[PDB]
Design a protein around this ligand. Sequence first.
Ligand SMILES: O=c1oc2cc(O)cc(O)c2c2ccccc12
Length: 113
Amino acid sequence: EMQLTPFLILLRKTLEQLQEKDTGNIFSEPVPLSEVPDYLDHIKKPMDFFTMKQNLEAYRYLNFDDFEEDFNLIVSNCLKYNAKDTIFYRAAVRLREQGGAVLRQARRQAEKM
Ligand SMILES: O=c1oc2cc(O)cc(O)c2c2ccccc12
């Protein structure tokens, strides 16, 4: 297996690169529940990049799949909650596309560790 600290260095850089694709900063912080009062009704597990950074430092991500699972939640939650003809829905589609390539490259670096 691998050493913890270089893996976490790689996840930190990967998280920064995914945030870079969210040019609108739509997903930087939790969805404001005080402004979306019905959000938790059908979104079981909210996720966002700030929570992911906290989970990263809290060792919730010890393999690439758990990291990618929470990124996929950011995307899938947004596709689920929002109608297809919204800015939010299209932002999540774009993040899924642009983020997918970021993750493939980062995983190949992890797979060399
Ligand atoms: O998925 C979202 O849906 C929203 C719906 C709204 O009506 C209002 C919102 O501020 C959001 C929102 C804000 C930040 C990140 C994601 C979302």
